[PDB]
Amino acid sequence: MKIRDLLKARRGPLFSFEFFPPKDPEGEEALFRTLEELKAFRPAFVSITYGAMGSTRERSVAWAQRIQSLGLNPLAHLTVAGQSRKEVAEVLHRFVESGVENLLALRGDPPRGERVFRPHPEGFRYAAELVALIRERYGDRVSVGGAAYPEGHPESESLEADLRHFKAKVEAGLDFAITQLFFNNAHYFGFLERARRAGIGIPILPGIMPVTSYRQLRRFTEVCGASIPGPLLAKLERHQDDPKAVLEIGVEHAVRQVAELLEAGVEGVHFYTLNKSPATRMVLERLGLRP
Amino acid sequence: MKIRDLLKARRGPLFSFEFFPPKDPEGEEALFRTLEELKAFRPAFVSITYGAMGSTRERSVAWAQRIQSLGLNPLAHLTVAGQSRKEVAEVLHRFVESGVENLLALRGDPPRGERVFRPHPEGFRYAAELVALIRERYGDRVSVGGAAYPEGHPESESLEADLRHFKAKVEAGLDFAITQLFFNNAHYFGFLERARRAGIGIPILPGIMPVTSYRQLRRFTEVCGASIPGPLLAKLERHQDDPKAVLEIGVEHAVRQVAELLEAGVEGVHFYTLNKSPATRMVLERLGLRP
Ligand SMILES: Cc1cc2nc3c(=O)[nH]c(=O)nc-3n(C[C@H](O)[C@H](O)[C@H](O)COP(=O)(O)OP(=O)(O)OC[C@H]3O[C@@H](n4cnc5c(N)ncnc54)[C@H](O)[C@@H]3O)c2cc1C
Ligand SMILES: Cc1cc2nc3c(=O)[nH]c(=O)nc-3n(C[C@H](O)[C@H](O)[C@H](O)COP(=O)(O)OP(=O)(O)OC[C@H]3O[C@@H](n4cnc5c(N)ncnc54)[C@H](O)[C@@H]3O)c2cc1C
Ligand SMILES: Nc1nc2c(c(=O)[nH]1)N(C=O)[C@@H](CNc1ccc(C(=O)N[C@@H](CCC(=O)O)C(=O)O)cc1)CN2
Ligand SMILES: Nc1nc2c(c(=O)[nH]1)N(C=O)[C@@H](CNc1ccc(C(=O)N[C@@H](CCC(=O)O)C(=O)O)cc1)CN2
Ligand SMILES: [Cl-]
Ligand SMILES: [Cl-]
Ligand SMILES: [Cl-]
């Protein structure tokens, strides 16, 4: 089913799960066994992150197919970095021809943690251009989401400019958005309020990634642009050499985050799930949301 | 200044304060000494609650004039209960001719000790009818707000019906709304999300009243329609006969609420302040907003 339809129809919050390209063949098989086990949670949709510069272009199409053949609903991530417009359109075509009904249109990061993005010579610069391409070619026959940033893209000059750019991307033809991970719910609620004042009505699903390793904080702050609230940071610093303690801290924090989001009427939660980590399923189990 | 203009031009949250009709002449002078002291805080606007059934209709106009003469910006509350349309229109005209630029258009509750609202036979039935009068008769000469109910008016059939009627009130000509008091921030955030999905973009300011006595809970739940979160209700139940402890519980609860609302970038906070209670001042001190 199209995500826009799942959202309109829901009997309760939609839970979705995003995984990562596996590192080796054993890991790939283990990921697909995990997806099979994940039916226990009745996921609204599942995805695997797309390699930013197109490194996974063939594998990603085959993964979308394999997800569908397990009876799960794939959200196909697609980026524009490192790829020509023709190359992007070819991958898009292969997803849709495969029966994919749901696309997440993304830019991609610049490589190796560089601050400044440079498009491929015959490529796109902005996710909005890929949203518009999808609509030009497929109209409403697919559902299209994009990324939202409650705390702003790191490269944006202000939250106000970042919101204007989000509105422009919505206007290119998004049906929904999924946020960047965050640890401070107030920043998600603040972004929703800015969106409301700007006349944005589409569903905006919070993205949650429980902290599972202390080493993650550098990526979360430097790449993702997420802030770590005082109390959480202090607990992680105090236990930074104890991986078991860190996991429990991250799960407990995410449980409290998700409980408040649900009480605040979110349409769903999108869980960023490291392939070998049980943390996101632990969060749903602790909230009593395992069917 | 018109509240619509203050909101558009704001550089940080607007803080507003609502007091109550004084009970005797010394209480009246004491209230105006409190308002004089409040000037240093630079509130965006201040108000005194309009008495049930028109009981303060002349005093309220004089009080709005006295607020102006202190250099403060009055918000004039005006209800329709227990008064003819012509009477309401007369008080409205007195406010406008006093130089009041800001009106809060309200229905009013049924009279003390009655549970059913019945309009005056030649009066208005809904706040939206007053909003419409103001727009027809004064247009942009005034800025008009209305009440919003994150947890629904008690007498509404459902939250969906409540929101539809809120939307109709907005459409009649609101520039902003101020919420009913609440104790669970998630219900405020949830209301904003429902409003966003219904295409309501006007500023909606949270109303906060710290719990100062156990006896208040009856009014808060039965008349105001607010829910009391379990942990708060537990603490209060245990300390009913310790007023000092109840004040501390209420103040701390309100501090934590407001800290999160401010982190969520609300356009302002509206404090319901009993004239002789230090609770609001204590909240502002604990937040670092007042010395
Ligand atoms: C839910 C989710 C899933 C993701 N999945 C993947 C994935 O599978 N693969 C991957 O590589 N990455 C993925 N990402 C990461 C994403 O690619 C990066 O965060 C990237 O740096 C920005 O992508 P974007 O689509 O948000 O960019 P865009 O929306 O294109 O924005 C890029 C920058 O340009 C600015 N901008 C936009 N419009 C204008 C304008 N009109 N004028 C000026 N500036 C403008 C924006 O504010 C922003 O600073 C994901 C992110 C999220 C939140
Ligand atoms: C910020 C704030 C300040 C206040 N100040 C005062 C004050 O100074 N003095 C005072 O007496 N009271 C005051 N009140 C209280 C208010 O008068 C009561 O809560 C009252 O019961 C409802 O007033 P309202 O304006 O919200 O009613 P309305 O908006 O008129 O709604 C009344 C009921 O009718 C329903 N409804 C609305 N339109 C329609 C329609 N077209 N058809 C059918 N049903 C409809 C609503 O859903 C609701 O159930 C204040 C409340 C707030 C939140
Ligand atoms: N800017 C941006 N935001 C994004 C993404 C991204 O790539 N870039 N993601 C998707 O595109 C998601 C986040 N992706 C993540 C990928 C890895 C780790 C992580 O914990 N990595 C470990 C190292 C793991 C390893 O080497 O095996 C770490 O940083 O310690 C965290 C988040 C959502 N938002
Ligand atoms: N429905 C409704 N909502 C409303 C109002 C109202 O009158 N009715 N208010 C504005 O119109 C504000 C709340 N007004 C309040 C008025 C008094 C007390 C209170 O504490 N009263 C004491 C009695 C004190 C006494 O007898 O002097 C109590 O209930 O214990 C609380 C809130 C905001 N919302
Ligand atoms: Cl964006
Ligand atoms: Cl006139
Ligand atoms: Cl209403």
Numbering used by the authors:
A (entry chain A), B (entry chain B): 1 to 291
Question: What text comes from the article?
Answer:
The flavoprotein methylenetetrahydrofolate reductase (MTHFR) catalyzes the reduction of N5, N10-methylenetetrahydrofolate (CH2-H4folate) to N5-methyltetrahydrofolate (CH3-H4folate), committing a methyl group from the folate cycle to the methionine one. All MTHFR catalytic domains share the same β8α8 barrel topology, a typical triose phosphate isomerase barrel structure.
Here, we report the structure of a tMTHFR holodimer in complex with an N5-formyltetrahydrofolate (CHO-H4folate) substrate analog. We found that in the presence of CHO-H4folate, the tMTHFR dimer adopts the same intermolecular interface as the tMTHFR with half-FAD occupancy (dimer mode 1), despite the presence of FAD in both active sites. However, in the tMTHFR•CHO-H4folate structure, the upper side of the PABA ring is occupied by Arg219 with Phe220 (corresponding to Phe223 in eMTHFR) relocating but still engaging, albeit from the side rather than from above, with the PABA ring. In tMTHFR•CHO-H4folate, where L4 adopts an open conformation, in addition to the water (water 3) that bridges Asp109 and the FAD N1-C2=O, there is an additional water molecule (water 2) that is inserted between the folate and FAD; the hydrogen-bonding network between FAD and folate is thus disrupted, and the additional water is hydrogen bonded to C4-O folate and the O atom of the FAD N1-C2=O moiety. The Thr49 hydroxyl group hydrogen bonds with the Glu18 side chain in the tMTHFR•CHO-H4folate structure, a residue whose polarity, as previously mentioned, is essential for catalysis As a result of the Thr49 relocation and its hydrogen bonding with Glu18, an extended quartet is now formed in the active site that also includes His270 and Ser16. The longer distance observed between folate N5-C and FAD N5 in the tMTHFR•CHO-H4folate structure indicates that the ligands and active site residues are not in an arrangement (as) conducive to hydride transfer.
